[PDB]
Amino acid sequence: SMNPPPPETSNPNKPKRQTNQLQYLLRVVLKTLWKHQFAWPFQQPVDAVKLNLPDYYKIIKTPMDMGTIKKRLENNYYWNAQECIQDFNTMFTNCYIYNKPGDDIVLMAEALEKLFLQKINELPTEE
Numbered sequence: 001s002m003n004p005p006p007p008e009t010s011n012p013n014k015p016k017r018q019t020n021q022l023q024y025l026l027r028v029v030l031k032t033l034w035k036h037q038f039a040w041p042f043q044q045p046v047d048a049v050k051l052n053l054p055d056y057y058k059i060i061k062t063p064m065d066m067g068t069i070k071k072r073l074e075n076n077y078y079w080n081a082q083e084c085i086q087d088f089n090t091m092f093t094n095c096y097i098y099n100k101p102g103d104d105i106v107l108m109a110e111a112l113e114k115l116f117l118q119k120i121n122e123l124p125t126e127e
């Protein structure tokens with residue numbers, strides 16, 4: 001029923017890059033999803049205490065959220081675009097695993113995921 005430590009957003013010994021694809025993931029993908037009317041449940045780690053989800057972290061062993069992704073992008077945590085894309089996919093998958101089809105939160109995730117897919121489709125070629 002307690003919250004775990006959040007995913008890390010800083011690891012000085014992890015090697016880092018700033019690439020055109022990563023810049024797109026921040027400026028286009030993250031920013032598009034972040035401003036959406038359905039972003040709010042996904043803007044920070046799930047607070048299982050506040051939300052009264054005592055079993056959340058019993059079920060979800062790889063938590064991810066856009067607050068974490070935003071910090072990772074802004075603090076140049078990633079080596080490549082695939083790591084960040086995987087984080088978005090983890091976030092969506094967790095929501096579908098934990099919740100029931102058609103729940104409000106599932107519809108919200110699906111709307112954000114549709115936009116995510118559209119933007120990833122135009123991921124720029126590595127420069």
Ligand code: NA
Binds near residue numbers: 096097099101
């Ligand atoms: Na489910």
